From a paper:
The inhibitor shifted by approximately 0.5 Å relative the position in the wild-type complex, resulting in increased interactions with both R155 and A156. Telaprevir has reduced potency against R155K due to loss of van der Waals contacts but exhibits better potency against [name] as it allows tighter packing in the S2 subsite. Thus, while telaprevir's flexibility allows adaptation to [name], it cannot accommodate the disruption by R155K or A156T. Telaprevir and other linear ketoamide drugs select for A156T variants by direct steric clashes, while linear (BI 201335) and macrocyclic drugs (danoprevir, vaniprevir, TMC435) with large P2 moieties select for [name] variants by disrupting favorable stacking interactions with R155. These data also support the converse observation that [name] variants are uncommon in patients treated with telaprevir as the drug can pack tighter in the S2 subsite.
The HCV [name]/4A protease – a chymotrypsin-like serine protease – is a prime therapeutic target that cleaves four known sites along the virally encoded polyprotein. The [name]/4A protease also hydrolyzes two human proteins, TRIF and MAVS, which are part of the innate immune system, thereby confounding the innate immune response to viral infection. These complexes include wild-type protease and resistant variants R155K, [name] and A156T each bound to telaprevir, danoprevir, vaniprevir and MK-5172, with resolutions ranging from 1.10–2.50 Å; S139A protease variants were used except for telaprevir, which requires covalent bond formation with the serine 139 for efficient binding.
Residue numbers in the entry: 989 to 1181
Write the structure that this text describes.
Amino acid sequence: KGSVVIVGRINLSGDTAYAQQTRGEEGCQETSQTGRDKNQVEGEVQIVSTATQTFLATSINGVLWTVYHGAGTRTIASPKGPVTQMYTNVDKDLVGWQAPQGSRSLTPCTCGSSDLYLVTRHADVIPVRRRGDSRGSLLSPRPISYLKGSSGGPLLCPAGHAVGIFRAAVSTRGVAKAVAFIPVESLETTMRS
Ligand SMILES: *[C@](O)(C(=O)NC1CC1)[C@H](CCC)NC(=O)[C@@H]1[C@H]2CCC[C@H]2CN1C(=O)[C@@H](NC(=O)[C@@H](NC(=O)c1cnccn1)C1CCCCC1)C(C)(C)C
Ligand SMILES: [Zn+2]
């Protein structure tokens, strides 16, 4: 097995979103195998790694959420050693840990806006137009490479509240046309029986 390892962070507090890498490929390979990570955590969105993949994870209501197809049943490396998952929902493709010390949690969106904002792993903020429970159109199509690594990141309100967790793109010939996401309501259902 192995722990998922925070290799970075996205800050959404200020006027513009930015990414910081805080750990390289060699130091991440090391920390996955110990499960002990003494680095300072900050931000709403974390950049996380397994042995194969690098993607996002997002704190909402005190829980760091990401995708199950990326994270699996893995522990997360922390300053007190490896932390077990608090929630595992394979049906909803959703796993969550106790939000790490240092982090900030997003609030669930209560406004029902269909104007969403996808935060990518490069801290690009892309407008998405909500279409149903779990889908949204891209106002501009992108190469899927643009979104590769963003699984686990948030879709936001215009108010900066969590609408959902990005998990997949609908793609034709390497051009993403839409995004699929885990709605924040599903995260709420997961905590609430
Ligand atoms: C995300 O996990 C990530 O950042 N991973 C780190 C980089 C390694 C990653 C982000 C991709 C934009 N997500 C995925 O890889 C997801 C996962 C979760 C669900 C299945 C796999 C594949 N996947 C995708 O996003 C794919 N999308 C699809 O398979 C969609 N299907 C189509 O687009 C399609 C199918 N038939 C004909 C034409 N188009 C399905 C559609 C239904 C909902 C699930 C996604 C790719 C093709 C990788 C974009
Ligand atoms: Zn809202």
